[PDB]
């Protein structure tokens, strides 16, 4: 008389679990990502990447390039009026 066994005939529902979808995602998501890297590209040399590093990083929101660009325009147009217009 019927000796039927559900537990080891569950083996196609043991792939069926929902976090498996997350698992196979995040072994691939974590197959190459650096833990935090060593020191990637925060600073670089484009000779204006150095400018960016001091002023236009997340390291500095300092108002200094704005000031610099402002002062440039003040220097620019006063001489230039007599040269162009």
């Amino acid at each position: 008389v019927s000796t039927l066994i559900p537990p080891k005939v569950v083996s196609s529902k043991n792939i069926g679990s929902a976090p498996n979808a997350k698992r196979i995602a995040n072994v691939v998501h974590f197959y190459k990502s650096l833990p935090q890297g060593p020191a990637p590209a925060i600073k670089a040399n484009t000779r204006l990447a150095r400018y960016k590093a001091k002023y236009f990083d997340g390291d500095n929101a300092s108002g200094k390039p704005l000031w610099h660009f402002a002062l440039g325009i003040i220097a620019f147009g006063y001489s230039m009026e007599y040269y162009f217009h």
């Binding site: 000796t3 537990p7 080891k8 976090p19 498996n20």
Partner: protein
């Protein structure tokens, strides 16, 4: 969480097979016991008629 499920299943897979065998094996022995029951039965009847 997933690891927890998996660990259970590993141990289960072997041990459940033991029970599978065991259950049907006992049932076979119990079949043979029916022939014993018939020995018991006929003798009981015989004593009763004789008592009458």
């Amino acid at each position: 969480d997933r690891i927890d499920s998996v660990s259970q299943l590993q141990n289960v897979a072997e041990t459940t097979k033991v029970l599978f065998d065991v259950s049907k094996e006992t049932v076979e022995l119990e079949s043979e016991a029916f022939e014993l029951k018939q020995k018991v039965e006929l003798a009981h009847e015989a004593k009763a008629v004789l008592d009458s």
